[PDB]
Amino acid sequence: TLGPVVTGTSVIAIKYKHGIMIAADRKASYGSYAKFQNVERIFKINNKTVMGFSGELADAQYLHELLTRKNINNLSEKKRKEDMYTPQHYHSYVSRVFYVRKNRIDPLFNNIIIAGINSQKYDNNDDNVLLYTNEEYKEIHKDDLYIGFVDMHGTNFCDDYITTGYARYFALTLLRDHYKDNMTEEEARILINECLRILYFRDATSSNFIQIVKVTSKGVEYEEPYILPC
Amino acid sequence: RWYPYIDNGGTVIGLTGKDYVILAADTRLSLSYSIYTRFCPKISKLTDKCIIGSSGMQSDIKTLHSLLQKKIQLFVLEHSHYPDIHVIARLLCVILYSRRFFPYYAFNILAGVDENNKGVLYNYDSVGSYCEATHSCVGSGSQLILPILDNRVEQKNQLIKNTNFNLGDDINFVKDAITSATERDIYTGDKTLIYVIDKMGINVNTLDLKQD
Amino acid sequence: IYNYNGGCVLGMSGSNCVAIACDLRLGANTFTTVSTKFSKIFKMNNNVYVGLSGLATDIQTLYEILRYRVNLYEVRQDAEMDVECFANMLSSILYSNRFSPYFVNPIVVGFKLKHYKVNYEPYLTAYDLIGAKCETRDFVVNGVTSEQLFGMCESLYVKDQDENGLFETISQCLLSALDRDCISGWGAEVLVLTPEKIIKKKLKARMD
Amino acid sequence: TTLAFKFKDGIIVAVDSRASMGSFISSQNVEKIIEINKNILGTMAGGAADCLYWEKYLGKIIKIYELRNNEKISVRAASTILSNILYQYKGYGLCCGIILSGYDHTGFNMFYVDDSGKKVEGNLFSCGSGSTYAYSILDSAYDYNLNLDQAVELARNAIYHATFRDGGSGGKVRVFHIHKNGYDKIIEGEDVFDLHYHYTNPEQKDQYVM
Amino acid sequence: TTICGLVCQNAVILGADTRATEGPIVADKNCSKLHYISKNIWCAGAGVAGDLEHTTLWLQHNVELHRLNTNTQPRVSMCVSRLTQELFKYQGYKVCAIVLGGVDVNGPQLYGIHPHGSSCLLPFTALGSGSLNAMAVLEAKYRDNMTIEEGKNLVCEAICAGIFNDLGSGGNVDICVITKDSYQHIRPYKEPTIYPKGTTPILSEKIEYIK
Amino acid sequence: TTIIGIIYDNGVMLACDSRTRKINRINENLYVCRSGASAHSQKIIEIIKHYCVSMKNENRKKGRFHENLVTKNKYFYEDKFNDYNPLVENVAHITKKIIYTNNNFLSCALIFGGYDKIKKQQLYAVNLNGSIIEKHDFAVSGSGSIYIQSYLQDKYKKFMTKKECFNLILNCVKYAMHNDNSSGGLIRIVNITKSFVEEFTVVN
Amino acid sequence: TTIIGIIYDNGVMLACDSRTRKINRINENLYVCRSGASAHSQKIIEIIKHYCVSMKNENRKKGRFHENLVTKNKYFYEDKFNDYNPLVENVAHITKKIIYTNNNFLSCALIFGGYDKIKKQQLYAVNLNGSIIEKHDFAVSGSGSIYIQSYLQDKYKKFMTKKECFNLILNCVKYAMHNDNSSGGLIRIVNITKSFVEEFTVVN
Amino acid sequence: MDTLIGLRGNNFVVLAADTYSINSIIKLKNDDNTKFYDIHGNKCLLLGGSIGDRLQFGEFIRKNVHLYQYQNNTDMFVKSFAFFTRKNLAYYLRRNPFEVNCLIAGYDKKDGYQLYWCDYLSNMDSVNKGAHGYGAYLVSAILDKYYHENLTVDEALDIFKLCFEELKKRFLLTQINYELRIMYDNKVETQYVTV
Amino acid sequence: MDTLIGLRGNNFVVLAADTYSINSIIKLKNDDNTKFYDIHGNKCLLLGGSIGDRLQFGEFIRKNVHLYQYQNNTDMFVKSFAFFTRKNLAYYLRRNPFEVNCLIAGYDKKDGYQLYWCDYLSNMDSVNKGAHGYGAYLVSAILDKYYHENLTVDEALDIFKLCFEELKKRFLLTQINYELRIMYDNKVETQYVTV
């Protein structure tokens, strides 16, 4: 609320065929100490939406309670799968929250990504939802996908690839050089690994113990964390 | 010790005629020395015969445009007729002055066509002052393009003079001006949307500029 | 500090023809002028001209320093001095007070002689307040009204041009730039040098 | 640079048309005189948005008072209302500078109002960057019982000379005339360029030196 | 501004953009950041361009005098020493960060100079506002013992990546190839309304014919 | 100030220094070790003890169910099976809320320790501002813990005995006291287990 | 920045990180590892190398006398018996003088390492300002050495072997790299002995 | 603070300035003589600012110009006097600043009757007319209005009387007493005015 | 800035103040009326400071005193008027300060002719004589010198004439025009003076 203390590094989000891919290093640095090297920095609101994080951890946690409990209220007044809120809804909600906190001058020292799938014609997961506990992938049109961004100042937009932190110079350059449309999972993961390798080799606050999450027709898939090949 | 003001940067160009108004703007968002995305339209359509463009903080212009569209839709619902451009101009003046002491970082241009088929153009500051014009520009490139519009439209410091102007020449002049701004300013953009308004509705085209 | 005595200078090139122009204002306390003859252009050699924009005392002091150095150079060498040599020497003088500098953003406009008959090549360049030289090969602008002039010249520049069309182009660019600046204006002068002759003209500007 | 003085056939009000964001002019044509009432005008100076919004608010309140009481308001009451509301925003950042002039039941009256609640009654006023030049030329050549033509000529020349030594002031001159039955616009807008080359440089030979 | 340097097979390749800014505007669209020190040493940097120009001319002419006195091939480490002493003596206020490159008797070696007087030999580097965009793709694609053509293509990958990304950098891309014998300077490497006569008014005229 | 917490087999340990009683008993199965400002920490300790008594009363079911010197004290739990003792996740998260809503003033890093039936021995690290991370291996805070960060990383094992963790945490705080200047006095250690908690102090 | 120096039997070792070549060769029998500002340290390194060459020339007598990857280099001493190589006490004390006379600007902690006939292997620690202390056990500097202070204190022995000190200093810098955020890259290590010096780097 | 006014035309020059010696909130005198500095030959220097600064600068410039004229046995040109004063003021500005305004005037055979404005930062340029101080605002537009070519000395004195009346009536420091210095027909006439 | 002078003796009271409406460096008028505030009954309030502050405070105090007199149907005592003004000024000082000096005067049956000094921080006390502004320095010692018991109104006006002559001659703002307000024999006479 007054300044950053415990900081995360950066996240990368890209859309491809069958869904989107979002990645983040599991580390939160206490300045120049690196106290925590196993932190969950990618969160889930519901199926077909996730929340990114690069900044102060307390604000991300507060926004995580707000967003996940907004999803709880959505489920508690749900009757059909189409009544589930889209990533546009949550992205606008975070944008309004950041704008209001800016006007009050009590900001959140974070740079959020909201991304997922803004359509329901591809899977029947949301008709009978499963919060606690939990085929072939179905190709998803890029128009039905969505990736968004929220700045400290509330600035927002949408694009096929969005990154935060120091990845907005390194990884954004690699994506603008190399990002195609409808790349398979292997090519996307190779590109993400190359960008995170370049970040690890030239960013103190980053690391190699990477978390990777996917948002597809099957739903949100928290894969096993892996150390980068380097 | 946090300053809630950043110039995302941009430019919006406006020009009028006998029975039309041309408004053009970039489609680049950015930060100080880096670009977020290559497509972020700042022009928001308000009515069938009115649009608004802006430059400055992206969040402030989005909130202002959506709030103004809310007020316009409530006005149509309560009063059963669309508001005129002068009405929208005074409403935006009152909205801007409501936040006098924490002002919007938004330099606005309000274009449209009056009920008498006259292309109007209002230009704003951050606080709320406004005045009708036949040519205006705001944003980072405002100092660049504004002398050029003064040379073309007003055409003072000239003796031979030529007032024969039509829609195509005005559009081409706007394309030349925004291209010159893109060459001569770093925040300007890479693709621009030339909104054109006429008695027969609204048309919108797109043009590709330099990517630097 | 440059709002105090706001000023502007300009210079274009063409086909065996070069132009330089300036405003004639001298300010005091930003928003009140005191003279409408203070020329920022100073003749220095038969085919070299210099346009100094900034604080008036620094403009004058730099003019006398450069005139001292120039007239020393022609008297010792006993021959006319080149534009590049004057530009480099100007950059050295502006750098020699890197700390506590002369608050002036000058330009240089003239002709380059290539002996063999002789060919007059146009030459134009601009400087920061330290001597950050940058050859340009076309329109060069410097002062508080620099942005407006940059906007005007690209719309109005037509590459190589006749001296009459060059005078119309540079005059319209300067007049449109000065009208949009409150602290710069109050008349103008346009010097159009050619190898045969130089034409000096003053414009019926919005001097009020 | 605003201007206002009182004479035999009412009141003459004159203003410039420049508008500055600092060293750069936003617009060369504006309107600094608002019909607050059919019989009352008010000039505008300082912060543009502040003065514009507050004279329009005062016009609203005047319409309330006249429509309730069915009597035209005086200039003193409007000036008092303006100075009271502006004093509520003291120490906030307002820079309103206003000269209110009009005809009422008492007679021809004129008031000056500032952001600090500075209500001052008089017969000659001028606010802006070029206020001193206009004051100097009027007090050199202002008299009571002079004709309307002389009055508009004097106001136009004063606004010209204020623009001459003020970059902030410029554009066009708008000289209005207030009388018993409302007001008329003697000069809607007239360029200072031909004004200069009529007054100070009638012969278009050589730059004028000063 | 974007600058880069690279060490290759018995050669060094430098690269830079061709744009300079005077705030949010652009003054020169075809500037020259690359500067000549010696026949086998070149440089390019970012900061106050007056400081860069004067310091580079000083280093160039001092190296020329040192070569003439000693009659030996100039060395890059000597230029590093003169620059580091020059920037350390003036307290770091002369903000001019320079990418130094050359090919001396000890083979090719690139150097990176900083404002405060520190230095470090590196195989590759980039400086300026658009440094990170360029040098990311450099380390993505950099290898040891390239061919010269691969080095030039990678240099256009870096400087053309920074031109498209960074707002403070743009224009043409410069390349210079430095070698033990000879050099090459490819200045344009890649490269990615008339008024009538008497239109303006006047009130004075005076023709002075030139003798 | 040095603060250390270590999870070992069937239990959890905590430690501090005595320089300016940093461990505070919120509940029988729940102890918290305080770092940072004394006044801020003591105020939030009073408030969190108030909240713990509130939920401990509230979550009670209705009817009948389940038919140098190493001077030490032992306190067996009154509540067997953890029927109504609150959960350490809950108390840690309301503590996170309290520090976050008042982070402009409150500057205190707290590390929590207790045993729960649902998730067994736990260790939560409340940082400056409202940041909470569950540490499965060990937790550190205070100035003196900065120097023993690699020592703890080296000598920690996955499933440690009571004596192993005793000697490791004691040598850890001793090395922090030796290196760090603002830590000293008798060392206090608290071992929290499934069925009891034992408090023992070391004067060396 | 992490900097570590350890005295072992018949020799001495030094170490650093590679993030911003921190070890600098003043002389064959004399190496110095730099911490703090890069420019300040490099300027005083140039000046102290100048002074070392000056005294090394000056103290020469007149006539004849004495009738992952562990990629390594070895440099045998040219001067046997240490006839004219300067003393590390002398170079360290003039370095202390230089930092003290310019302590208002110069902010750099340097640790020195070399072998002398008079006093054998030595290790001098030049701190911020002009403070010099001869460390018989070990020396530390930089941000990353703060975390391994107790690890070095625990695992140091009086008369260590070359391999023992190799593994200890390598694990020390590895733990400092792991904990500290501003240290990384390949580790550089220099072993200085009676009759030779060997430079070897570790990429892990 | 200290009002200085100057006017120049064909075959005359006039200078003027208030006669007041301000200290804190009072006047040491109403008949000051520290502002005008007569130079040998048809020349003068009128200074405005703090009393000590104008005393030191005016005496220094006057006595150096006298030294030049005595060593060289010739009358210094007016343009040389003005630019020498500017160079001295700029040099002292860069090291030991003299917060003092200037109004250089004189007569020369080669240039005729001429005047020079000059600010406290040595912002110097030839002018037909000018003023200094806060009173420059309230008298300069009068001088624009009533100045024309082929003027006479009496018309100029009428303009100065108008400016003094304006300064008494409207300017905050209602300055009453003034001292003039007229140059015309190779004479230097001084007058004292009380409006 | 704004000079206020006041004198009180047996069977008279005099107030005085300059008539000037200062804005920046000029005068809006030379015949100001915003400083004096006539109260119903033999009472007055003379204010000095910024124009808006004295306008708001004087109108507020005057119209509240009028409210008291109309509700209660009796003339407010002078001492009550002075201390009520002080309490209002102190209350507004603690929250929304009014940088304005005061000189309360009037006539009462029980206390007679009396005067009260009061500063901008509500530093109030009865006095026979006093002054405000920078001109208080240059007129208060005159008032000590030429005041004596059993004075008359003409002698007081002569003293005020001496003070006005001193303010014209020696004070930096050479104030010429003044307005007086004499209370004597159950009358309130106003005069305008130009020395």
Ligand SMILES: *C(=O)[C@H]1N[C@@](C)(CO)[C@](O)([C@H](Cc2ccc(F)cc2F)NC(=O)[C@H](Cc2ccc(F)cc2)NC(=O)[C@@H](CC(=O)N(CC)CC)NC(=O)CCCCC)O[C@H]1C
């Ligand atoms: C006479 O002396 C004359 N001088 C000027 C022209 C000097 O600026 C001005 O003061 C003018 C008033 C004005 C302008 C336009 C208009 F339609 C009505 C009007 F009354 N003053 C200004 O324009 C402002 C300068 C200023 C003065 C004092 C202050 F304390 C602050 C500012 N400038 C503006 O109002 C400007 C933006 C603004 O609000 N600012 C500056 C950033 C303050 C927050 N707005 C415009 O110029 C018009 C809208 C934009 C058109 C594209 O008038 C008389 C006295």
